[model samples]
Target: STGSATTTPIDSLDDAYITPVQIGTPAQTLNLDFDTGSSDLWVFSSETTASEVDGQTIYTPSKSTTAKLLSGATWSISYGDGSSSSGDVYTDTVSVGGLTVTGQAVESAKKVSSSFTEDSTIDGLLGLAFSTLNTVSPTQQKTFFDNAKASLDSPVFTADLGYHAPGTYNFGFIDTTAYTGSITYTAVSTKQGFWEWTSTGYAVGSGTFKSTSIDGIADTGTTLLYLPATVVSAYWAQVSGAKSSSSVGGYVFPCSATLPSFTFGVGSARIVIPGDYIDFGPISTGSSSCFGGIQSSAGIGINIFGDVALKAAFVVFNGATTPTLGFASK
Candidate 1:
């Protein structure tokens, strides 16, 4: 009825959070990226080209007695970073934490981009977005969350991503002590298959909260928060010597500069992100210039409340027939 696990950041900047998952009958364990922005439970497998895999673990479907070929089915996906992976499909028993799902679609990678191969810590991705975004065809498949929700005690999951530490991810029930204050519930638009919601406004540091509706998607799969150009510029302007650089391709400030905290309105609640959280990391090892966690989403076409924003609060992904999102300060 319930499942729980810890997700750990793989890098100092909290670039990505990884959770261990079990696949196949005998159960091959692999660390996967629990992404809310995409809907495809794909893994690196025996089918993936040898040259494409480095030190990462691979799922061998043939070793699993429960594995079956999903004949004629395939999946392909490309991310905003230009990273891509594609493969054939298989049906197998999959488990995460204590939850199990039989006949779960397990996409095995046959090809992958250099970026994925170079990043060996993430063996695959477990999508938490709506099943409507599933890429599998002839018949699209349901995500792990979608198939397991029917039996999940609460029909929901919570993401408590940490700044530089391991975070908790719980399914079926929310931990009462996971956050402070009551949750602010908001309607979610699944039309685009994302956890899309509109924020009432934002404030740079302790500045006034702008009374404007900012539409954005909450994505754990992304590493930074991307906002409209005007809002991003305002935050940077508060930091001394902060500049948007063309060579580095993002806003950067002196590593020693003090940054103002960021605040965004969720319903009637205010979720505050500490200034330290916005200091992404140094542009290069030992560099004096640090990257800003808040960036402009102008080129991206849509505002994104990614990891930088998600880590500021406890987020609930409600998977009821009529889906909604819940947020609370931590």
Candidate 2:
């Protein structure tokens, strides 16, 4: 919370702007959600309409013989929570990791109900963060990191968001041995590819709300970390003696208790947010549970920071320079 901005140093982590395609080919099993803000790589097809989809993960252009369908090009998406999804526009021949990003562009909703297809557990969403919220129309949309940055050997496309566990988002290459040393950036600031910060308050547990300073935007596509309900009710009213119920609208608390260790001051970078990420899991209507990584958007006026604060840092989305947004240390 001091003032330590300018810090650049990203040599080999280069190939991150692309390389890492593969969404449905060689058998059909795509899973992506690099989501800068929202570009689109939706999968969960299988001709869909299985009663509109029960669990999710549709993507099945007849199991892909190398599908492709832009004869008309149609797709729809609606979120904020309302929930929506149209369908059409398909193209396959994907296969990241080993590389094979032909045709790409996919989205076969046919019709998906909000909450991202009725509580979607996760089946597809390789947004990789940004391209002007790309719906792939610079001409015909081909961003799986621009086609995996043309056979990436290295350049940088690293993400490690392993919060509750499982962390991996690597397109191109940039391991540098799981980070700790080289990698400290902060650039992107185009109109609104988003990745802005300025905080200087927030420190639960030992208790340290300061005065509640805040700036906005950081989304991975949002997971939870929304604040500004008067700084989330004056920082949970100093932990309200470990309050225990508020339900999904947000602010549940009491996941067992040990909680209290939050930090969010990004100018110089503070991040933090650990207390099992505040235990948020159950709160559809009400039962008792709402601490889960600081909640309360209150009308949603700004202040984002989703993916529980990018799973704890080490994010870099250069958008090929010009439209910058950087941060390192995976």
Candidate 3:
């Protein structure tokens, strides 16, 4: 069976997308961020402390007759942004867009970081990465997609991330109508439990495309695009008044500056990001200085094609043997 779900952007952040998911027997609905960067299906639950609950909805296992504890098992996860959560384990029914997976390991949070506590809209995270990255103690846990793959018509999923708009995530089958033109396929290297790929090269504005290879991961959980420092410097150089600001923690430019477009190569496909998309709005309210959406990925070891980049194209996360990536214009 094939499954599909609509993803909605969070409030003013417009950084991550959340989808509805049901857990337990009576189906407690929760809005979860479907993250492709990490593997851990965790949620705010009755287990979380009162002070940590904030305004987010909590999942109560006690209400579900089918919930069963995986005794002695626990989970802890941390993201690049320093957001983290930890909890005990429960085997229960988990459903996404009508696709149900029985005995899915659902981590119930007993602790969460401030990043999560403050953002009350996101109830939890639905990890879409490989099962190898799952943080369940003693034994690795499979993601909701992984457990539901065997029952699907095809072991493939597609991401249609939008810019400040609703998007869709399809499971088991690719919806041909969701994308325009042919999907350019590229092999993925999952050695690090990520949808990592080597981009052929990039160019700023209408400049000639360079063929330098850059290794990076396609991370939907990330907010902005991150490339090598040199590449970031090259792009910022063209923007007058742009400079590295220790206070802002990234390169900032005049909000009125005429920014140049950025382009990246995905195999034979060339995806271009408009200047406005790279602007990323002002650094603070009432300020004319804006933070660039593209920044240096120096210390990270690998570049990141985050929402700013992914929203430019329809992406296919092929879970079949030798996981592949397909890119197409929306």
Candidate 4:
């Protein structure tokens, strides 16, 4: 499966792109981003009338060997970044790795904003995250998992981010070397329309932050760790001589003397964020570089550990396997 997963680097954007498995065989190609933040797989279509969308690869149902539309169930979605797209609903056979499931639903975007439409390098997003974020509502549509469950050999699903280093993203299966073979599971807390998971507290260097424990959501849609301001400031305070600095719209720090390593205490599972990944884009206050693991966001939901924290361990999504999550890593 050398071509099953790929990591595309975005220099100016300061982000990594995860290409989702296509819907056909090796002969035909269709790659997308399997986003966990939202449960939906959407790709651009040849029918898209938006001329502003210049560089994105649009999926043309007419050109594919297998394509079936849902009559007229078209839709649109807007992201937090003001980017949006409009598309139609269709069902097709989607194959990933050695796994193949039929009648999989996907979106054929016909109208997309320039920000989203002009990215020809990658195709679109393949949302295989949590079912709670799934767009296949019982009221209207059925999700890919909703139909592919019986085809899975086991209910358990694991994502092994064996990128082996910072700035890389890998999915599927869990890595057992990162943790002790033990993991404490918890039931997802659903409060305000979002599935949330809380951690006891996090340990930095060798000291645990006594009051930094907060219940937050784990979303694959996001790529950065969004921690609370107070906790962020407190955590940064310990990074030797960490200093805060301002950037475009958020904060960055500078601490180059020594990279600060931290462990997230998720029940009994401890997730470690290596300093190498932190240095990918270190925060700077003038000339000094600060630790880049944790930072502030424009929200009040404690901390949202993005891909930075995910790379440290293996994550398992037990929704179809069971309602429990499993973690392990090297």
Indicate which candidate wins on TM-score: 1
For model 3, what is the C-alpha lDDT against the true structure?
Answer: 0.91
Q: Tell me the whole-model lDDT of each prediction, alpha carbons only.
A: 0.94, 0.58, 0.91, 0.58
In candidate 1, which residue pairs get closer than 3 Å at backbone N, Cα or C atoms, i.e. clash? none
Q: Which tens-of-lDDT digit does each residue in 52-154 have in candidate 1?
A: 9999999999999999999999999998878999999999998888999999999999999998899989999999999899999889999999999889999
- lDDT of each residue in 26-92, candidate 4, tens digit only: 2245656555455677776677776745666566676666678777576667765577776677777
Model 4 off-target regions past 4 Å? 1-14, 24-27, 50-52, 130-139, 162-180, 190-195, 209-213, 240-247, 255-257, 282-293, 297-302
Global CA lDDT of candidate 1, please?
Answer: 0.94
Kindly report the root-mean-square deviation of model 2 from the true structure over all alpha carbons. 15.8
* Per-model TM-score on C-alpha atoms: 0.99, 0.33, 0.97, 0.80
What is residue 327's positional error in candidate 1, in angstroms? 0.5
Candidate 3's TM-score reads 0.97
Instruction: Compose the digit string of candidate 2's lDDT tens values, residues 31-58.
Output: 4445565667776677666776767555
Worst 10 residues of 1 by lDDT: 298-307
TM-score of 1: 0.99
Q: After superposition, how far is residue 277 of candidate 4 from its true place, in Å?
A: 1.7
The clash count for each model shown is 0, 43, 0, 23
